[PDB]
Enzyme design. Sequence first.
Site, PDB file in Angstrom:
ATOM      1  N   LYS A   1      -8.353  13.935   5.737  1.00  0.00           N
ATOM      2  CA  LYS A   1      -7.466  12.788   5.616  1.00  0.00           C
ATOM      3  C   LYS A   1      -6.410  12.978   6.705  1.00  0.00           C
ATOM      4  O   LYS A   1      -6.297  14.059   7.280  1.00  0.00           O
ATOM      5  CB  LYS A   1      -6.797  12.782   4.238  1.00  0.00           C
ATOM      6  N   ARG A   2      -5.625  11.949   6.990  1.00  0.00           N
ATOM      7  CA  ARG A   2      -4.596  12.075   8.023  1.00  0.00           C
ATOM      8  C   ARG A   2      -3.590  13.175   7.660  1.00  0.00           C
ATOM      9  O   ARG A   2      -3.203  13.297   6.501  1.00  0.00           O
ATOM     10  CB  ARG A   2      -3.881  10.726   8.193  1.00  0.00           C
TER      11      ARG A   2
ATOM     12  N   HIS B   1       0.780  -1.242   0.000  1.00  0.00           N
ATOM     13  CA  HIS B   1       0.000   0.000   0.000  1.00  0.00           C
ATOM     14  C   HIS B   1       0.812   1.293   0.000  1.00  0.00           C
ATOM     15  O   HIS B   1       0.234   2.368   0.144  1.00  0.00           O
ATOM     16  CB  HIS B   1      -0.923   0.071   1.227  1.00  0.00           C
TER      17      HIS B   1
ATOM     18  N   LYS C   1     -14.568   8.153  -2.210  1.00  0.00           N
ATOM     19  CA  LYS C   1     -16.496   8.798  -1.110  1.00  0.00           C
ATOM     20  C   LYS C   1     -16.865  10.145  -1.707  1.00  0.00           C
ATOM     21  O   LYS C   1     -18.027  10.360  -2.033  1.00  0.00           O
ATOM     22  CB  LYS C   1     -15.687   8.939   0.178  1.00  0.00           C
TER      23      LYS C   1
ATOM     24  N   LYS D   1       0.672  14.631   1.766  1.00  0.00           N
ATOM     25  CA  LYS D   1      -0.710  14.896   1.373  1.00  0.00           C
ATOM     26  C   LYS D   1      -0.916  16.397   1.136  1.00  0.00           C
ATOM     27  O   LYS D   1      -1.948  16.839   0.629  1.00  0.00           O
ATOM     28  CB  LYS D   1      -1.681  14.374   2.428  1.00  0.00           C
TER      29      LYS D   1
ATOM     30  N   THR E   1      -8.689   6.722  -1.010  1.00  0.00           N
ATOM     31  CA  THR E   1     -10.028   6.120  -1.030  1.00  0.00           C
ATOM     32  C   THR E   1     -11.023   7.217  -0.686  1.00  0.00           C
ATOM     33  O   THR E   1     -12.197   7.157  -1.067  1.00  0.00           O
ATOM     34  CB  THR E   1     -10.168   4.965   0.002  1.00  0.00           C
TER      35      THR E   1
HETATM   36  C1  LIG Z   1       1.304   1.235   4.881  1.00  0.00           C
HETATM   37  O1  LIG Z   1       0.799   1.868   3.687  1.00  0.00           O
HETATM   38  C2  LIG Z   1      -0.459   2.486   3.771  1.00  0.00           C
HETATM   39  O2  LIG Z   1      -1.107   2.513   4.824  1.00  0.00           O
HETATM   40  N1  LIG Z   1      -0.898   3.000   2.627  1.00  0.00           N
HETATM   41  C3  LIG Z   1      -2.133   3.719   2.408  1.00  0.00           C
HETATM   42  C4  LIG Z   1      -2.574   4.486   3.709  1.00  0.00           C
HETATM   43  N2  LIG Z   1      -1.760   5.426   4.180  1.00  0.00           N
HETATM   44  O3  LIG Z   1      -3.742   4.368   4.103  1.00  0.00           O
HETATM   45  O4  LIG Z   1      -3.107   2.666   2.106  1.00  0.00           O
HETATM   46  C5  LIG Z   1      -4.383   3.064   1.532  1.00  0.00           C
HETATM   47  C6  LIG Z   1      -5.175   1.839   1.183  1.00  0.00           C
HETATM   48  O5  LIG Z   1      -4.435   1.071   0.253  1.00  0.00           O
HETATM   49  C7  LIG Z   1      -4.141   3.895   0.228  1.00  0.00           C
HETATM   50  O6  LIG Z   1      -5.363   4.356  -0.297  1.00  0.00           O
HETATM   51  C8  LIG Z   1      -3.224   5.128   0.569  1.00  0.00           C
HETATM   52  O7  LIG Z   1      -2.957   5.870  -0.598  1.00  0.00           O
HETATM   53  C9  LIG Z   1      -1.905   4.686   1.156  1.00  0.00           C
HETATM   54  O8  LIG Z   1      -1.168   5.821   1.470  1.00  0.00           O
HETATM   55  C1  LIG Z   2     -11.328   6.949   3.843  1.00  0.00           C
HETATM   56  C2  LIG Z   2     -10.770   7.462   5.089  1.00  0.00           C
HETATM   57  C3  LIG Z   2      -9.403   7.770   5.119  1.00  0.00           C
HETATM   58  C4  LIG Z   2      -8.433   7.676   3.821  1.00  0.00           C
HETATM   59  O1  LIG Z   2      -8.700   8.911   3.105  1.00  0.00           O
HETATM   60  P1  LIG Z   2      -7.664   9.393   1.991  1.00  0.00           P
HETATM   61  O2  LIG Z   2      -8.141  10.771   1.712  1.00  0.00           O
HETATM   62  O3  LIG Z   2      -7.561   8.385   0.962  1.00  0.00           O
HETATM   63  O4  LIG Z   2      -6.356   9.393   2.845  1.00  0.00           O
HETATM   64  C5  LIG Z   2      -8.928   8.230   6.287  1.00  0.00           C
HETATM   65  N1  LIG Z   2      -9.744   8.351   7.364  1.00  0.00           N
HETATM   66  C6  LIG Z   2     -11.049   8.046   7.361  1.00  0.00           C
HETATM   67  C7  LIG Z   2     -11.810   8.310   8.670  1.00  0.00           C
HETATM   68  C8  LIG Z   2     -11.609   7.592   6.207  1.00  0.00           C
HETATM   69  O5  LIG Z   2     -13.023   7.338   6.113  1.00  0.00           O
END
Ligand SMILES: COC(=O)N[C@]1(C(N)=O)O[C@H](CO)[C@@H](O)[C@H](O)[C@H]1O
Ligand SMILES: *Cc1c(COP(=O)(O)O)cnc(C)c1O
Length: 804
Positions: free
Chosen positions: A537-538, A346, A649, A543, A645
Amino acid sequence: ISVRGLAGVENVTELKKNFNRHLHFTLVKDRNVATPRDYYFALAHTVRDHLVGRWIRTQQHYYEKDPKRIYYLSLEFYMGRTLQNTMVNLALENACDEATYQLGLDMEELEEIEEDAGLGNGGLGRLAACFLDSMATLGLAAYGYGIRYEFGIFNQKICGGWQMEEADDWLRYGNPWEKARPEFTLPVHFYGRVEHTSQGAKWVDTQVVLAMPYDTPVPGYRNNVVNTMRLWSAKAPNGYIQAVLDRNLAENISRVLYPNDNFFEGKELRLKQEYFVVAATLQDIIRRFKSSKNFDAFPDKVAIQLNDTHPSLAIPELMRVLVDLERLDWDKAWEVTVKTCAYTNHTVIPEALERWPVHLLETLLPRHLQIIYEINQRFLNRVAAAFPGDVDRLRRMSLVEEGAVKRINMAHLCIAGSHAVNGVARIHSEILKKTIFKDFYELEPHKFQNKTNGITPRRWLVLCNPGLAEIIAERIGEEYISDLDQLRKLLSYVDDEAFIRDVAKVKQENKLKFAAYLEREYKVHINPNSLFDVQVKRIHEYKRQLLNCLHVITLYNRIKKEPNKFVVPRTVMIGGKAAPGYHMAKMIIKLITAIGDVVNHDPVVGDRLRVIFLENYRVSLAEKVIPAADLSEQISTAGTEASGTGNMKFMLNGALTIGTMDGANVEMAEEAGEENFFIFGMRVEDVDRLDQRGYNAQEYYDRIPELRQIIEQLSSGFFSPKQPDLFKDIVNMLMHHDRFKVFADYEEYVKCQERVSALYKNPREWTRMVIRNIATSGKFSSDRTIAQYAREIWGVEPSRQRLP
Ligand SMILES: COC(=O)N[C@]1(C(N)=O)O[C@H](CO)[C@@H](O)[C@H](O)[C@H]1O
Ligand SMILES: *Cc1c(COP(=O)(O)O)cnc(C)c1O
Ligand SMILES: O=c1[nH]cnc2c1ncn2[C@@H]1O[C@H](COP(=O)(O)O)[C@@H](O)[C@H]1O
């Protein structure tokens, strides 16, 4: 709302009966003192009863039928709340809504009581949760296996503009969904030493930690399938007081989720958690295998999917069991292991890849390190045979890294021990074969695949946006809920005046509801007639929330420069958690709040621009804010966000996207047509060209007057008057140590944002573009992703056939 099912008279009667019964017998409360919480619990138990028959019948059906079993191992399962999801999948939503209403209660208010099961950091954790939902919906005999953390991701409080972490005691009031299974508790071993006798190897003198499973039902969408998520809880084995108190040491293994997103922290406790899940899970797998129809057929009956390298120890652990305990010859055991396991990577961010020091492994898992060294030797023997004389390739491909601190590369172990390796978005999977795992792709090209991520349309559309799900069903029916590609049919309405009116009505309804939520729960006021610009997002440097920050200040500065000039009103919302030890991410959260402190109180700006930080971003919050978003910020530096992801959404919920050509943004733009997206900035090729000649932030600062102004505002204390040098670290990073080239995308980003505002000025055309996005989001349903995993990796065929 028709997608919510029927409210049959008998069903409603029965539900109210069981609601009152549970309030009496289960909660031991009487109506005169019952609180909304008590009522939430009464409903949850009532709804839970409906899952039981199916849960038992489903698992019984698998034992009878004996289909190949899918074991999805993950250290995270970010499930969020379960009540609404359960009613939705069982077609009970309207019935319960009517029943509770007849009881004088508001079902939605009750739903707000439930604690998010936040056993995940972000993307990867949520993906695991969407995958569980899709596997059940696709009728796969799949088992989610992880660890039952007592504390999930911390609750984020913002105090004085800074993040403060509070323990997430999600189990205080209990979890009505899970079922403790103490009778199936298993032993997990640690430390010890290895003896080599006449029977081979023996792992002895180990310390034991017991793994107690708790099972949670996973309901498919109206197919009567209820699969299981099994989470392990650590228990101490069977002077005196201190000895009893010390039981906490072994039980600490499942106490808390490491709160890091895309960052590897090589703590021994984390390694214990990883082996813990793996050892217990694999005992379950071997047992089921033995009581099914011997090991030649193991791969035909078992599939072990590794969610990143976190549970990678499953490879040497399976070899340990097969060789040391089942006495299989090494070669045979390895053939079986490779055919059984598959690895999903990932990330490519180097600081996120797991590299465990060998001394830690030698101490904690001596037998596993020996097995790993043997795996390496035979693997490098094949590399040498395939590329004779290529000594550096051997060094590069080795599972063992050489430095001051010798380490084991877990990703290399996974590739060597898996028959399939996949990335999570086309661009990421291609990047894997081209860079990071190029040597491996060259040795075994057929192992490498792509499985673009997805999100479940149940939670991410039907649950969170009933208004949108309803106007869509009004036109195309309900089949799309478990066949998202059908949303394409909506392209037939780009010129339908009623649909255009309703799509806009639904979005405005969600924006009002979200504004009401922020006023009620956080006492924050936002202008409902403004463009909702959202980046949730985190918090991470890659990012680029910081780029968003530069834009926000640009908007503020332009308004101050020309106060009488009209600008599309905006409410810019940024939310997300920062890992506790991540200094820069925490400084960024503070800058966000500090910008708002100035911007939100300048009378000249008034309600034309507002910047708010959304506290405690989590799954339940995502379900509220995403449906209310107009613009979705997906601005990572090209090549850094493996997939994303949240992007998908937002697309599914009617927001337009402004982002770079990164992760799944690429595929999203391809599906909707670039003319319906707001793509900007450097592409991966451009980033590399900049890396080749060297990134010099000073050049951009020197050549862009507006950027210069902002940096000087930060450096001089304009956003922190009582502490002028507060953001010196951010400025220094941007000016001299920016790995993510924020300045390099500033101009194109500001220009692209201008284009966004222009289209928003034309409600009709904004909405028509939105329709073109929603209508082409189908490829991003996790049902598609999972069906691909099933057919291309697991070797099983998905199915939508209902169970009795
Ligand atoms: C250890 O690597 C990760 O956790 N990778 C991550 C993430 N941080 O959520 O995984 C999710 C699910 O595949 C990806 O959508 C995201 O771009 C990636 O950065
Ligand atoms: C989907 C989701 C994420 C991942 O979002 P990205 O914008 O792809 O990093 C993180 N946190 C929560 C609470 C989510 O629902
Ligand atoms: O030995 C057995 N006899 C009859 N039914 C069994 C037996 N073992 C498992 N089952 C059934 O199969 C289900 C699957 O259990 P599991 O997959 O081992 O968790 C059990 O709950 C029972 O319904």
